[PDB]
Amino acid sequence: TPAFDKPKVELHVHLDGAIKPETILYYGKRRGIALPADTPEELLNIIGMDKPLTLPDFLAKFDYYMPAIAGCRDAIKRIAYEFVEMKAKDGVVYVEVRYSPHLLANSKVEPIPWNQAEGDLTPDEVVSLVNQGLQEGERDFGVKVRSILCCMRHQPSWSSEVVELCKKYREQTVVAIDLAGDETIEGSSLFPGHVQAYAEAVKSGVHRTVHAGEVGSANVVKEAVDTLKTERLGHGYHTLEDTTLYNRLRQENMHFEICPWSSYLTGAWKPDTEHAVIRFKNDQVNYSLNTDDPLIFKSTLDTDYQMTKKDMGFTEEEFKRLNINAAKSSFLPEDEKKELLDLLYKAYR
Ligand SMILES: NC(=O)c1cn([C@@H](CO)CCn2ccc3ccc(NC(=O)CCCCc4ccccc4)cc32)cn1
Ligand SMILES: [Zn+2]
């Protein structure tokens, strides 16, 4: 009813798509930007999807709300905080949250995002503020939280400062680097920018995830494993298109960060098909359940859980093992990771 009331782990959720409708009206109103509408209510319904659209119809969503938050220090910090209490309500005990620091900035970034005017919020103090509110979320709401800073495909030039933001803000709360945005652009996993950033990540012990095979071919996953050296995959559905690659990843115990509900809504999965997750369930792969963008997809974690237990016969035993897998493949230090494990066993039995 909730499908699974037991603590949970989430490894794959974007901050900048888990923003309360109510607080976007609050900052659009207080700053000029003025959204396409002005009850909370009527706002969620347009900035949210119920059906697949195209890529530019998807990005335009960002184009309503982002400029109302980006570039206000006030806002950056609250959304971080409000993110943590949103997760306490889902029953999460540990989450990793990801975002691009450049996309919330308005100076020392080129271009300037969202066609904002120039201010003085730089990439590097955005990571400082999210960290703040993420920490005081932690200690008010009971949810252990870390973060992930996203590289953007289209912009290899930002990547090297992503990886240095990762190193400078190390366990306080940044634990990994990611690559997001549009794995359709040719060759983008092999751009020199992204490549040397992941090399520097390897060099300096920052953990790695990549979004790959959501909408891209299995060759994009292969680029992610062999050349970017990821430790985990965002989505990775398209690895199923290549069977040796799939079998090998299974042997290697790769972690797949699955977004079930996300997948239907985006078009990455078409409901006339096998869901990739049930395959992963039947093959006992290492995967997690995640909601990706609850603002956009209209959703909550328990949405993912309900869709998996209703439409695909998951059971309570699977749900527990997948959260155990999630924890094991989390990017915590080994010590805090054993304590997380122990916690879950004790409440799973
Ligand atoms: N789910 C996501 O892809 C996502 C990305 N973000 C932020 C960072 O946390 C980036 C927002 N953003 C800005 C430029 C940009 C360019 C591309 C993408 N993402 C993609 O290309 C993934 C496509 C998402 C799946 C899909 C496919 C086809 C049609 C509709 C939807 C995000 C982008 C938040 N959520
Ligand atoms: Zn994602």
Side-chain angles (χ1 to χ4, degrees):
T1 343
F4 181 71
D5 41 78
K6 268 305 164 204
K8 288 168 289 295
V9 201
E10 182 172 41
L11 305 183
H12 192 126
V13 214
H14 298 261
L15 182 49
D16 55 346
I19 295 204
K20 319 296 297 188
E22 279 85 308
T23 95
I24 301 159
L25 287 191
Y26 187 89
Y27 290 94
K29 292 259 298 304
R30 113 130 236 76
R31 325 197 301 153
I33 287 88
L35 300 322
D38 220 276
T39 61
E41 314 157 83
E42 100 193 283
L43 191 67
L44 188 248
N45 313 288
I46 108 151
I47 51 183
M49 294 160 64
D50 20 307
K51 21 173 70 290
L53 336 154
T54 68
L55 224 211
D57 330 73
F58 179 87
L59 299 196
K61 305 192 162 189
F62 292 109
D63 293 55
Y64 286 142
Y65 72 98
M66 294 299 296
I69 308 290
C72 219
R73 299 167 170 97
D74 215 16
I76 309 323
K77 222 181 81 65
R78 215 211 291 191
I79 64 165
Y81 191 89
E82 312 188 323
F83 175 87
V84 190
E85 55 124 332
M86 271 174 49
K87 312 332 261 158
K89 312 184 177 167
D90 292 312
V92 179
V93 279
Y94 172 79
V95 47
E96 294 168 9
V97 67
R98 81 181 52 192
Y99 69 97
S100 169
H102 305 75
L103 303 183
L104 290 166
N106 66 19
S107 46
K108 274 174 197 167
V109 48
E110 268 268 310
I112 305 232
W114 318 120
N115 338 124
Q116 291 171 89
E118 171 155 17
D120 58 359
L121 229 196
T122 76
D124 167 75
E125 58 174 317
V126 174
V127 9
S128 198
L129 293 113
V130 168
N131 285 163
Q132 248 210 63
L134 234 38
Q135 292 167 129
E136 61 212 43
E138 158 140 353
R139 269 149 288 89
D140 294 5
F141 310 88
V143 178
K144 164 104 128 180
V145 196
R146 306 260 81 83
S147 50
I148 315 189
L149 282 2
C150 289
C151 290
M152 307 294 293
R153 297 234 179 218
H154 79 278
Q155 202 83 227
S157 64
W158 302 341
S159 309
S160 85
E161 61 169 308
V162 16
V163 87
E164 294 285 296
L165 269 3
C166 306
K167 288 163 50 180
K168 169 174 187 194
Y169 289 108
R170 218 180 179 119
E171 86 247 325
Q172 295 193 180
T173 67
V174 200
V175 300
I177 196 196
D178 180 33
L179 207 221
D182 198 19
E183 20 148 11
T184 267
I185 56 208
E186 175 194 319
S188 64
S189 319
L190 273 13
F191 304 154
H194 304 146
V195 350
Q196 215 64 193
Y198 275 70
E200 183 68 36
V202 186
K203 219 288 288 145
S204 64
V206 340
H207 285 286
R208 305 165 296 281
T209 186
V210 180
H211 290 69
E214 179 187 9
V215 96
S217 77
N219 208 58
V220 1
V221 161
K222 175 147 52 61
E223 299 163 324
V225 177
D226 307 323
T227 141
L228 276 356
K229 315 291 161 195
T230 24
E231 308 170 288
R232 323 164 186 125
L233 297 159
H235 305 275
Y237 303 147
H238 285 263
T239 125
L240 253 352
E241 89 160 62
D242 168 353
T243 105
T244 310
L245 178 63
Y246 181 67
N247 281 309
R248 171 225 175 170
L249 299 178
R250 73 43 78 162
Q251 173 205 57
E252 234 157 339
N253 201 49
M254 257 289 327
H255 189 87
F256 300 77
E257 317 167 347
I258 312 289
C259 318
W261 178 249
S262 183
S263 78
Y264 169 110
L265 244 39
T266 72
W269 175 69
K270 268 282 128 311
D272 68 69
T273 350
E274 59 124 300
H275 190 86
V277 77
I278 71 282
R279 187 67 174 277
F280 303 163
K281 177 186 52 71
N282 295 152
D283 296 338
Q284 319 255 73
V285 349
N286 190 185
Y287 74 95
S288 65
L289 250 33
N290 294 274
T291 202
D292 205 13
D293 305 90
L295 204 229
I296 302 197
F297 307 133
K298 237 125 78 172
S299 74
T300 271
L301 242 191
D302 215 80
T303 320
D304 295 269
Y305 278 77
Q306 300 275 169
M307 188 205 176
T308 53
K309 177 211 180 179
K310 256 62 52 46
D311 294 88
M312 303 168 215
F314 284 44
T315 63
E316 248 106 272
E317 333 281 7
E318 187 63 22
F319 296 147
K320 294 178 169 162
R321 95 143 188 120
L322 135 216
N323 287 106
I324 299 301
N325 280 334
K328 287 179 162 356
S329 322
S330 72
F331 293 147
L332 275 337
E334 280 293 292
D335 67 309
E336 315 171 26
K337 158 150 31 177
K338 306 311 115 164
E339 293 180 22
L340 185 72
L341 253 343
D342 287 335
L343 184 318
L344 289 308
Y345 291 130
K346 298 170 195 87
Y348 287 173
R349 158 177 47 151

